[PDB]
Amino acid sequence: HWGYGKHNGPEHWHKDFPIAKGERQSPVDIDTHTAKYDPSLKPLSVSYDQATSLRILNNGHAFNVEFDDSQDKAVLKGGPLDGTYRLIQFHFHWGSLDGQGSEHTVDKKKYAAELHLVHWNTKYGDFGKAVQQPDGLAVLGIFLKVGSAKPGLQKVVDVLDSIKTKGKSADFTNFDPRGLLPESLDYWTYPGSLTTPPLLECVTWIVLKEPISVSSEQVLKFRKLNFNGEGEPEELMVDNWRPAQPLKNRQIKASFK
Template sequence: MTILYLLCIIASQLTVVFSSAGNVWTYKDSLGPDHWHLDYPHCGGIRQSPIDLQTRDVVVDQAYLSPIIFSGYDRAPKLFYTLENNGHTVQCGLNDKTMEISGGGLRDTYVAEQFHFHWGATDERGSEHSLNGKHFPMEMHIVHYNKRYENFSISVDKSDGLAVLGFFFEIGRFNKHVQEIIDHFVEIQYKNENITINSIPLNDLMPARLTNYFRYIGSLTTPPCYESVTWTIFNETIEIAEEQLVQFRTTIFENDKSDGGLPMDITDDYRPVQCMFRRRLYASHPSLKYNMEAGKTINSGASYVLSRLVFTYFVCVWSFVT
């Protein structure tokens, strides 16, 4: 049993006397991720997300993890999307329930509900998941609920209730499809502002190659952190221009317009990576187990992960001895 595994067990079993107030949560300070479990017990579970995708540890299963079948992703739905600033992220409600995924090791068919983003204040961080210790500047999640259940609300806490597709962003070419979302930021700058926008095919937002991916069982990455998610993280990244990413960092605020205070940018809206415990990480192709490109890209993002691990170590040790 490794030291890291022991530390994970200690961290998950910690009990505290004091609780944060109400059911309010943030990404920083006394209401940040380190305290979520006080109000949301599931956040202290042993199947939490996100995680660091360690390619050396993956189990390759090409037969089980066949290509995912995307239905309706190649066309724009008839209904408008609902774009909103919920104080934690930019989220787009799809409204139309005709976009589905199946196959790819999924036991059921899942209906697309919404997509949203997580981003950082610098290019070295922002994604929730990391790859061999490397974080990306942004990550997009497309959230689906199990079609066997009536809707998202009923599915959200079921063990097989949700399937989320995760995509990493890298700085590169101007992304005209993401720009269709960014163009509306001025209308949803503050918390709880929302508008309707023209629908676009989800295929336009995703990479061209979708056969190489990682798979594991985890949770929502925000409270209440239900452990109900089958995660699929794709290896191929999405390009976005630096100036587009700046729009995420500077024009979307976490506070309400009526607060009267200075606007507070939503940046670093991501949860730190969680312990794997005894879970397995699967891959759809052998190349993902020995991804040399991933090894070359470990840079300052890795140092940030290391600092988080050191911090967690001292918190766990201090709590254990006291």
């Protein structure tokens, strides 16, 4: 099964998922100088006031905080998007060291981690149908750098001991994802893919310019999770990031100058 180890990591994924060598794969390096400012890009609309988190799950490749997406409770609109996209889950990718961990890079710079808030286009009715469409998902990507703590992340950090191993889930209600957002919603955007198998080319990527800062203790607790299931040999869940993929025939647009 695919993973991030020596024999099943990202360079192996194309054998099971040939779209890995596709024309709109993610993540990518964001060359800030080559990104073009687009004045027709609208500001992003993040409407998270009514979000209903339900639980948190270790799926063996990251942990997902899952939301009730059966109504327009937490939605993303505006920006490059047409229509309304509902938040279904968020998760992170992170490194074994503070110097790596993000999937997107900015002028080749790697951040300590990257948060992905995953949304699906309501015109397709549910997530499973949306991922089959070229405009099915909008993923809001937010970089994490190590510095001061992010208070809004602590409730996530504190529950991770209850989902250490693959397959464990925990009730995780009343979590407000607004506590994970930076001050500015300036963004880059490009058409891309899921960054884990099945690598489907269904994502409008919206990557925020401004990182959030989290503490060293906060990211250290991510690194205590396990890829393995309980009662299997312990392999720390670290470096669960795919490296940058060829931009090919794509242009990254910026909402700011």
